[PDB]
């Protein structure tokens, strides 16, 4: 039981927490999925990263970062 796809907010905060130096506008779904799948705390499904799944996480990263 780690970071879950539906739990995009906790993930968004995780991303901004670990990567406050990175701008979520320049971060694409691909790039984000690399780091989010690289997360040691991440534990759900590495393949079911639906676009809107990654998008929700990207959008919340935008929300937190700015």
UniProtKB/Swiss-Prot annotation:
Q: Which molecular-function annotations from GO does this UniProt entry contain?
A: enzyme inhibitor activity; ferrous iron binding; iron ion binding
Q: Which InterPro entries match?
A: ISC_FeS_clus_asmbl_IscsX (IPR007479), IscX-like_sf (IPR036762)
Q: Which GO terms describe its cellular component?
A: cytosol
Any single biological process term in GO:
iron-sulfur cluster assembly
Q: Which Pfam families match?
A: Fe-S_assembly (PF04384)
Assembly mode: Monomer.
Main function: May function as iron donor in the assembly of iron-sulfur clusters.
Q: Which family does it belong to?
A: Belongs to the IscX family.
Name this protein carries in UniProt = Protein IscX
What is the scientific name of the source organism? Escherichia coli (strain K12)
What taxonomic ancestry is recorded?
Answer: Bacteria, Pseudomonadati, Pseudomonadota, Gammaproteobacteria, Enterobacterales
